[PDB]
Design a binder for this molecule. Structure first.
Ligand code: HAS
Ligand code: HEM
Ligand SMILES: CCCCCCCC/C=C\CCCCCCCC(=O)OC[C@H](O)CO
Ligand SMILES: CCCCCCCC/C=C\CCCCCCCC(=O)OC[C@H](O)CO
Ligand SMILES: CCCCCCCC/C=C\CCCCCCCC(=O)OC[C@H](O)CO
Ligand SMILES: CCCCCCCC/C=C\CCCCCCCC(=O)OC[C@H](O)CO
Ligand SMILES: CCCCCCCC/C=C\CCCCCCCC(=O)OC[C@H](O)CO
Ligand SMILES: CCCCCCCC/C=C\CCCCCCCC(=O)OC[C@H](O)CO
Ligand SMILES: CCCCCCCC/C=C\CCCCCCCC(=O)OC[C@H](O)CO
Ligand SMILES: CCCCCCCC/C=C\CCCCCCCC(=O)OC[C@H](O)CO
Ligand SMILES: CCCCCCCC/C=C\CCCCCCCC(=O)OC[C@H](O)CO
Ligand SMILES: CCCCCCCC/C=C\CCCCCCCC(=O)OC[C@H](O)CO
Ligand SMILES: CCCCCCCC/C=C\CCCCCCCC(=O)OC[C@H](O)CO
Ligand SMILES: CCCCCCCC/C=C\CCCCCCCC(=O)OC[C@H](O)CO
Ligand SMILES: CCCCCCCC/C=C\CCCCCCCC(=O)OC[C@H](O)CO
Ligand SMILES: CCCCCCCC/C=C\CCCCCCCC(=O)OC[C@H](O)CO
Ligand code: CUA
Ligand SMILES: [O-][O-]
Ligand SMILES: [Cu+2]
Lengths: 551, 166, 31
């Protein structure tokens, strides 16, 4: 800790992160039962008395699970890992600043959320008007990542100062293109908070234009998903191959995936605005095409990762078409959790690809399908990857060991989570296909969707299954976090970074990819090009409208 | 061995990358198609049409729901829908089958959904703006409108009806 | 040759294909 103070900072990012996840997830099974046509909210309201509505709980769930936990995780992973690869200390003053910004922002935002003063959901679309403490508290939380951005660019430049004419190391390159992307990405929401949300919630302006808010929101709105995703990819790419018993089959192909994410993660936001008025169809088509493009790096990722796993499995004795699968370390939860998350990502990305296809969005937009799509994505792949990291990262950060028993419980939590997520995914997609809306207390209109009787059952089962997983995870996290035993040979042991398989790389591409400034600029131009004209028009004809509180 | 596997993996990844690229392009081609057909009617007209949410019920085409249905063509009807908390006017919307229906929908309070069950009509409704979509009902009868965008505590019970006459 | 990888992407493609074709058909039914 004196030698590596970055350990303690990263530890705080993780723990606060999982805390958000646990409290956020408490509302999960209840919402699952709701989409199963079962009303267990009276029970929840006795247990947690401050919960006033299904929709206050939905806010807590999304904000806490999708915004808070994921970010804290991203900040933990994409700071520590580049730092451990480069064997250099981060700017510690900055690292504690960013933590405190996140904590304080969280606590301030939590105040009105718990008090039923900002029941607006995690999208907070105007004219639904939340408490100023929510918009401020959110802002300070999100901004904390600019401080993260600095820290990593700092580490980066320092290294390059000591290493001119050397290419950027794999994890650090990932983390740099990641953060730089997030900076552009984040400009949408920053603008929306600063020009509209904050002034409005404080009383400074009377109204906000709903269309311009939604547009600026979804600027940040999409890339924030890749912001959640990439920390899990960085682990899947540079660590998972080792845990699997193999190596990363390609370093350049990893960089390409990541580069493509810097270039294609922001200029696509209109795919959330397919059914919005006042946006030209030609821009909706452009974005759709560009969205289809951004799916390429994950398509690419699918193969590289799968190849790496095959390599691992063959190295461990697996023979045949399917034999390498069974040869993998299915006893190790650090390996199991991500692999399972990648499995569900198949249907997850598949549903995403449908969502992007402009007109096909009308079939599914705003139905239970969407929730089904994204739970495979963030609530499964990201969450499970973070879950499995406990079994290598927590010991690395605390010295505390993972007992054999604790590893077994780890497998169980992981598997049950995965399965519940699959089950729920089936129930929601199908329900969405039956026109069942998202964001709806549907168990309170029990005669409204009789056609959805079947998928409702999956939803219920999913609810109880995921209640069990979450329960086991709570017990299990605290068993390792509040464990008596501590062993510092574990804290000093290296991060299980994989090696890169022996292939003459194409040093040409790697070098081109390393011209980061160039690529950052390009990425910026593409955002100006995809968003510029449309925002120009919208600002030229603003039509602000009174806020409303309807809860 | 390791030298060999790298060549083979990369050889087939390039294959894969090309194939997925094609598949994506073919989709793009298939999406471009739908924009040329009548099914594209449901895509909102991208034009900005500002209105005043505070006075929309006192003055304008939304002020008399009984007169919100208006023949604008030989075979075309414009309908002025108000989506509000928590319902839709008119109730019901009545249109004839085979006629092209141009829905001009707006909100006096918060953002609502306008999703016509059984159909591709699925459009966000924003206060201050008129959302414009086009559909031709091919089967007579009673379609349901659902509000698929969270609008407050009346959300789950906010429903509308379109009746299509022969 | 990476037989396992190819299997995985085979599954991935079929999933995308069933998904995409599925929803396309549904779109036209509702058209
Ligand atoms: C982490 C977060 C998420 C990711 C990733 C993400 C990816 C996609 N999204 Fe999405 N998204 C949309 C389209 C996509 C597309 C094009 C992709 C793509 O990036 C997908 C690429 C993925 C693939 C093509 C899959 C590759 C598979 C891999 C990499 C695994 C292979 C398996 C292996 C290797 C296992 C092998 C193991 C063995 C041993 C066998 C659209 C619209 O076009 C909407 C709006 C819909 C509407 O109408 O409202 C949407 C909705 C959402 C929402 C809701 C928004 C809201 O709250 O209003 C969120 C939260 C979200 C999150 C996420 N989504 N998305
Ligand atoms: C105990 C496991 C969990 C279950 C059973 C569960 C269940 C659900 C259900 C059924 C809904 C849809 C509710 C509605 O549309 O009204 C929902 C929405 C959502 N879930 Fe979860 N979920 C869980 C954990 C997670 C996690 C780990 C995350 C991501 C990190 C997450 C992210 C979200 C978000 C983003 C929303 C959308 C909220 C909104 O529309 O405002 N879920 N969850
Ligand atoms: C608002 C309260 C802000 C309280 C922030 C407390 C800062 C403590 C911290 O993390 O800084 C360590 C520093 O060396 C000094 O103890
Ligand atoms: C944190 C953001 C705080 C202040 C931003 C400064 C904005 C200054 C507020 C002035 C807004 C304004 O010019 O008011 C519009 C008025 O309604 C037309 O008559
Ligand atoms: C530093 C911490 C807080 C800044 C304090 C800012 C407090 C601003 C108070 C504004 C408020 O409560 O105004 C509601 C208003 O009437 C709109 O609906
Ligand atoms: C990558 C950049 C190139 C992308 C290709 C986009 C080109 C033309 C879009 C055609 C727009 C036609 C949409 C009209 C919708 C309609 O028919 O309106 C009702
Ligand atoms: C619909 C809801 C139902 C949910 C079904 C989802 C699919 C679940 C699992 C398939 C995963 C296949 C790969 C798992 C392999 C494990 C294995 O081969 O086990 C090795 C053995 O333990 C020697 O070590
Ligand atoms: C029809 C079905 C109804 C759905 C029932 C759902 C869950 C059952 C519980 C399943 C528990 C799965 C645990 C598997 C596990 O953790 O085993 C480790 C394995 O060796 C590889 O890692
Ligand atoms: C993976 C695990 C289990 C399958 C049970 C689902 C069958 C639905 C039966 C049902 O609930 O009936 C619906 C409706 O009432 C019929 O009339
Ligand atoms: C232990 C491992 C076994 C795992 C179980 C196997 C999965 C099958 C069913 C889950 C049952 C959960 C659903 C509970 C009842 C559903 C319900 O509420 O049904 C109402 C009906 O459909 C309309 O009136
Ligand atoms: C791992 C977890 C997997 C366990 C699966 C859950 C147990 C299923 C057996 C059937 C349960 C039988 C109970 C009857 C359900 C019923 O009728 O529900 C009551 C009411 O409709 C709602 O409040
Ligand atoms: C979907 C299948 C995608 C796989 C694409 C098949 C590409 C075949 C390939 O590139 O193989 C070259 C090999 O070295 C000579 O046979
Ligand atoms: C190498 C050869 C590569 C060839 C690619 C072939 C794949 C798709 C072509 C798309 C065909 C588009 C025809 C549109 C038909 C359609 O979608 O019709 C729906 C409905 O019937 C109307 O009312
Ligand atoms: C995973 C399991 C997959 C299961 C998916 C279910 C898809 C079913 C139907 C969508 C197709 C829509 C067909 C359009 C007809 C509309 C209709 O019949 O609606 C009543 C009408 O409004 C009277 O006037
Ligand atoms: C590992 C990745 C694997 C994920 C695969 C999931 C994709 C498709 C399976 C679902 C099959 C499609 C269902 C057929 C649709 C059907 O039968 O149509 C509805 C009908 O009208 C009555 O509702
Ligand atoms: C592994 C867990 C993942 C969960 C998997 C999600 C389930 C949805 C599956 C496939 C979508 C296919 C679309 C469904 C199309 C059914 C209707 C159909 O086939 O349409 C024909 C007709 O023209 C119109 O009614
Ligand atoms: Cu109006 Cu939900
Ligand atoms: O948002 O994907
Ligand atoms: Cu998106």
């Amino acid at each position: 800790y004196e030698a590596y103070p970055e350990k303690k900072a990263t530890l705080y990012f993780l723990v606060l992160g999982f805390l958000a996840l646990i409290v956020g997830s408490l509302f999960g099974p209840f919402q699952a039962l709701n989409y199963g046509n079962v009303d267990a909210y009276p029970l929840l309201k006795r247990l947690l008395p401050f919960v006033q509505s299904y929709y206050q709980g939905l806010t807590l769930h999304g904000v806490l699970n999708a915004i808070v936990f994921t970010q804290l995780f991203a900040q933990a992973i994409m700071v520590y890992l580049p730092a451990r690869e480069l064997n250099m200390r981060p700017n510690m003053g900055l690292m504690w600043l960013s933590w405190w910004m996140a904590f304080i922002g969280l606590v301030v935002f939590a105040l009105p959320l718990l008090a039923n003063e900002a029941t607006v959901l995690y999208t907070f679309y105007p004219p639904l008007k939340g408490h100023w403490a929510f918009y401020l508290g959110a802002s300070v939380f999100v901004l904390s990542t600019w401080v993260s951005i600095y820290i990593v660019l700092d580490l980066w430049r320092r290294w390059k100062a000591a290493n001119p004419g050397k290419v950027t190391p794999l994890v650090t390159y990932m983390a740099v293109v990641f953060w730089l992307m997030w900076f552009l990405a984040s400009l949408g929401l920053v603008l929306e908070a600063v020009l509209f949300l904050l002034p409005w919630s404080f009383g400074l302006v009377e109204g906000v234009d709903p269309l311009v808010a939604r547009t600026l929101f979804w600027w940040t709105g999409h890339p924030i998903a890749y912001f959640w995703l990439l920390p899990a990819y960085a682990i899947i790419y540079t660590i998972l191959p080792k845990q699997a018993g193999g190596k990363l089959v390609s370093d350049p192909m990893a960089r390409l995936a990541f580069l493509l994410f810097l270039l294609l993660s922001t200029p696509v936001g209109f795919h959330h605005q397919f059914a919005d008025p006042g946006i030209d169809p030609t821009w909706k088509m452009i974005h759709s095409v560009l969205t289809l493009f951004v799916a390429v790096p994950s398509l690419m990722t699918a193969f590289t990762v799968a190849a790496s796993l095959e390599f691992a499995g063959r190295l461990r004795g697996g023979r045949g078409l399917f034999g390498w699968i069974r040869a993998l370390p299915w006893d190790n939860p650090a390996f199991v959790a991500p692999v399972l998350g990648l499995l569900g990502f198949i249907p997850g990305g598949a549903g995403g690809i449908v969502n992007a296809s402009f007109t096909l969005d009308y079939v599914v937009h705003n139905t239970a399908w969407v929730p089904g799509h994204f739970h495979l994505q963030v609530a499964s792949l990201v969450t499970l990857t973070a879950m499995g990291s406990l079994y290598w990262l927590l010991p690395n950060l605390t010295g505390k060991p993972i007992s054999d028993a604790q590893r077994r419980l780890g497998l169980a939590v992981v598997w049950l989570w995965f399965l519940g997520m699959m089950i729920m995914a089936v129930g929601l997609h199908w329900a969405g296909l039956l026109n069942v809306p998202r964001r709806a207390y549907i168990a309170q209109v029990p005669d409204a969707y009789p056609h959805a009787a079947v998928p409702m059952v999956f939803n219920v089962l999913a609810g109880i299954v995921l209640l069990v997983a979450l329960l086991l995870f709570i017990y299990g996290l605290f068993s390792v976090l509040l464990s008596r035993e501590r062993k510092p040979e574990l804290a000093e042991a290296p991060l299980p970074f994989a090696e890169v398989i022996s292939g003459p790389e194409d040093r040409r591409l790697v070098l081109a990819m390393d011209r980061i400034g160039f690529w950052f600029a390009v990425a910026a131009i593409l955002v100006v090009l995809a968003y510029g004209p449309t925002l120009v028009q919208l600002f030229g004809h603003l039509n602000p409208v009174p806020g409303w509180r309807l809860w | 061995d390791e030298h060999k596997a790298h060549k083979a993996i990369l050889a087939y990844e390039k294959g894969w990358l090309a194939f997925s690229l094609a598949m994506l392009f073919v989709f793009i081609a298939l999406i471009a198609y739908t924009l040329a057909t009548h099914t594209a009617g449901v895509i909102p007209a991208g034009k900005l049409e500002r209105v005043d949410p505070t006075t929309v019920r006192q003055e304008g085409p939304w002020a008399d729901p009984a007169q919100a249905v208006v023949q604008t063509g030989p075979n075309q009807y414009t309908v002025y829908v108000l989506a509000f908390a928590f319902g839709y006017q008119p109730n019901p919307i009545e249109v004839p089958q085979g006629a092209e229906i141009v829905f001009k929908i707006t909100s006096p309070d918060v953002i609502h959904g306008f999703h016509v069950e059984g159909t591709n009509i699925n459009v966000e409704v924003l206060p201050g703006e008129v959302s414009t979509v086009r559909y031709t009902f091919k089967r007579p009868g009673e379609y349901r409108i659902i509000c698929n965008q969270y609008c407050g505590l009346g959300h789950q019970n906010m429903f509308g009806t379109i009746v299509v006459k022969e | 040759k990476p037989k396992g990888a190819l299997a995985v992407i085979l599954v991935l493609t079929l999933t995308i294909l069933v998904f995409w074709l599925g929803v396309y058909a549904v779109f036209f039914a509702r058209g």
